[PDB]
Amino acid sequence: TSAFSIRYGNLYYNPFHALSIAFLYGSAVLFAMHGATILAVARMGGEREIEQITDRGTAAERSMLFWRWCMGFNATMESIHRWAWWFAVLTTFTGGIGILLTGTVVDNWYLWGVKHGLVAPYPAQNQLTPEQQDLLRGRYQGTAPDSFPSYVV
Amino acid sequence: SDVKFVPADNYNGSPIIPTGNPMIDGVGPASWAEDRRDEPDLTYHGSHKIVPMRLDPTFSIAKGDPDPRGLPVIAADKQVAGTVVELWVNRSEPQVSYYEVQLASGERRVLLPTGYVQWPNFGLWGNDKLLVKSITAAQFANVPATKRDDQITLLEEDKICAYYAGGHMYAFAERS
Numbered sequence: 001t002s003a004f005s006i007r008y009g010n011l012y013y014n015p016f017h018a019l020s021i022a023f024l025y026g027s028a029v030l031f032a033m034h035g036a037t038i039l040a041v042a043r044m045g046g047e048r049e050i051e052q053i054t055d056r057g058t059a060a061e062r063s064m065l066f067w068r069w070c071m072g073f074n075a076t077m078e079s080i081h082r083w084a085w086w087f088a089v090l091t092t093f094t095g096g097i098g099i100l101l102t103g104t105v106v107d108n109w110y111l112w113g114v115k116h117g118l119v120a121p122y123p124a125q126n127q128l129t130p131e132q133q134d135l136l137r138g139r140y141q142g143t144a145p146d147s148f149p150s151y152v153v
Numbered sequence: 154s155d156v157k158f159v160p161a162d163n164y165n166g167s168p169i170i171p172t173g174n175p176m177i178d179g180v181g182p183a184s185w186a187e188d189r190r191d192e193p194d195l196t197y198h199g200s201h202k203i204v205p206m207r208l209d210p211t212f213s214i215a216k217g218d219p220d221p222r223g224l225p226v227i228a229a230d231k232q233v234a235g236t237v238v239e240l241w242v243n244r245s246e247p248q249v250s251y252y253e254v255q256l257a258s259g260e261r262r263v264l265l266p267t268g269y270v271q272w273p274n275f276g277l278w279g280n281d282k283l284l285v286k287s288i289t290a291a292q293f294a295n296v297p298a299t300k301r302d303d304q305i306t307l308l309e310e311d312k313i314c315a316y317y318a319g320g321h322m323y324a325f326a327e328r329s
């Protein structure tokens with residue numbers, strides 16, 4: 001997992017990886033919110049969600065109003081499970097696309113990030129002379145040596 | 154005017170103020186879903202989901218738990234409100250849904266949702282009484298009734314739970 005990110009030039013700049021994280025975090029946000037919400041009305045039967053969906057009680061109403069008063073909008077007892085479903089599903093769906101794009105369409109995600117303007121500028125930590133630019137070019141990694149050389153001479 | 158509440162003032166987004174007793178009228182945290190269907194909830198095979206335990210001999214107390222029947226119920230004002238006569242159980246997901254309380258110093262028996270009871274020492278030891286922190290022993294007399302004693306409707310569930318829910322705001326208030 002680490003070497004894959006190293007090989008393809010830092011997976012943080014893969015936008016589908018970034019999305020997959022947004023849904024992964026959102027799944028923890030939603031289940032924290034929803035778990036806490038249903039336990040906060042469980043003494044009024046809020047955990048009997050199928051009844052609250054088919055025959056709305058005060059436990060469903062209080063759950064809707066808490067979030068409406070908190071953040072200005074709310075789900076229903078049924079539709080919060082759709083938000084839950086999609087956030088979980090979109091975690092692995094966007095993840096899969098990001099992997100399929102990697103090494104097929106983009107080989108260096110940080111440079112793709114530079115191209116599309118994702119990369120914040122920092123002051124240069126070092127500057128190379130033209131002579132160093134040729135000296136410090138490496139070589140791509142090849143095969144291991146298949147012999148044990150003697151240096152007897 | 155029967156209207157349960159009036160605006161605190163004419164500005165947008167002002168609170169409402171209850172006219173009568175908010176616990177009885179059902180205002181604020183004492184309110185219930187008034188349009189809720191007035192029918193019993195049903196199991197998959199169509200029997201009544203919530204019934205007194207004496208009506209289904211399948212159910213029994215787990216061995217080494219206390220049976221709460223016959224214990225006194227201690228209300229928010231430390232008065233003895235009554236004693237547990239019966240348990241009501243959920244037959245779809247086996248648990249105790251309500252205690253039924255024979256009222257002390259009164260004729261009537263009332264339901265008490267177990268979410269509002271707690272054991273002394275949270276059940277670990279003692280277990281010689283029940284605590285109802287949310288309402289006074291006087292207010293136990295006004296807990297809503299079920300139309301029958303063998304079944305409870307979804308509306309009656311909402312009404313009863315809403316009564317104990319409101320207590321934490323209105324039990325110790327002159328707003329009655």
Ligand code: BCL
Binds near residue numbers: 017019021022
């Ligand atoms: C948690 C461990 C790390 C960290 C690691 C990562 C990694 C790794 C990634 C992110 C990603 C994101 N992180 Mg971060 N992040 C941290 C701390 C934070 C904090 C904070 C503590 O205040 C915030 C607000 C953010 C915010 C964000 C978003 C820009 C983005 C999507 C999050 C998301 O959907 O989450 C779940 C929450 C929701 C679904 C609710 C909606 C949240 C919205 C989107 C937050 C917007 C904030 C906005 C930019 C700033 C508001 C203030 C302005 C001044 C008005 N990070 C710490 C340091 N974060 C991803 C990304 O897209 O990066 C480019 C990503 O790949």
Ligand code: BCL
Binds near residue numbers: 002003010021022092
């Ligand atoms: C240095 C390391 C790299 C990095 C490299 C990678 C790579 C590489 C990948 C991810 C992927 C993911 N990374 Mg990243 N990641 C880094 C930093 C982060 C940070 C962070 C705070 O810094 C966060 C929050 C994340 C978060 C995430 C997730 C959003 C995403 C995985 C989704 C998922 O549900 O996978 C978990 C879910 C699964 C794996 C699905 C499994 C389902 C199957 C069917 C289960 C079968 C079980 C079977 C029956 C039994 C098994 C038996 C045994 C074989 C014996 N990464 C850095 C940049 N990350 C993945 C992705 O989608 O990338 C776009 C991915 O491939």
Ligand SMILES: *[C@H]1O[C@H](CO)[C@@H](O[C@@H]2O[C@@H](C)[C@H](O)[C@@H](O)[C@H]2O)[C@H](O)[C@@H]1O[C@H]1O[C@H](C(=O)O)[C@@H](O[C@H]2O[C@H](CO)[C@@H](O)[C@H](O)[C@H]2NC(C)=O)[C@H](OC(C)=O)[C@H]1OC(C)=O
Binds near residue numbers: 144146148
């Ligand atoms: C043993 O042999 C292997 C395989 O050649 C050498 O590994 C090479 O060099 C590494 C940089 C690389 O990782 C690896 O892929 C492979 O390219 C390993 O270093 C040992 O080298 C000595 O033996 C070499 C050999 O192959 O026999 C020999 O190579 C030279 O001689 C042979 C035989 O005449 C010829 O086939 C080669 O083409 C020739 N190569 C070169 C570059 O001259 C090495 O001699 C020299 C001078 O490289 C040996 O190295 C030493 C110091 O003895």
Ligand SMILES: CC(C)=CCC/C(C)=C/CC/C(C)=C/CC/C(C)=C/CC/C(C)=C/CC/C(C)=C/CC/C(C)=C/CC/C(C)=C/CC1=C(C)C(=O)c2ccccc2C1=O
Binds near residue numbers: 030083
């Ligand atoms: C800053 C500014 C412009 C000020 C102007 C002046 C104003 C507006 C003053 C008024 C006073 C105040 C304090 C206003 C607040 C203004 C602010 C800061 C608003 C921002 C609100 C906010 C945090 C928005 C973020 C929204 C996001 C992205 C949330 C992430 C989670 C998410 C995806 C939720 C969607 C799903 C929902 C709706 C979940 C809630 C929800 C859950 C969790 C249930 O379990 C449940 C169970 C049964 C029925 C309903 C529900 C239900 O609705």
Ligand SMILES: CCCCCCCC/C=C\CCCCCCCC(=O)O[C@H](COC(=O)CCCCCCCCCCCCCCC)COP(=O)(O)OC[C@@H](O)CO
Binds near residue numbers: 015022116117118
């Ligand atoms: C200060 C608040 C900021 C809120 C937003 C915070 C961010 C949301 C979090 C995570 C998203 C992570 C995945 C996205 C990765 C983002 C990086 C990315 O790929 O960007 C471009 C594509 O997207 C784009 O243009 C389009 C970006 C769309 C972003 C939509 C985010 C969700 C909705 C947000 C609603 C806010 C409402 C605020 C109300 C108060 C690149 O391609 P393109 O070369 O073509 O462009 C270049 C041009 O954007 C200049 O660089």
Ligand SMILES: [Fe+3]
Binds near residue numbers: 034038049
């Ligand atoms: Fe749920």
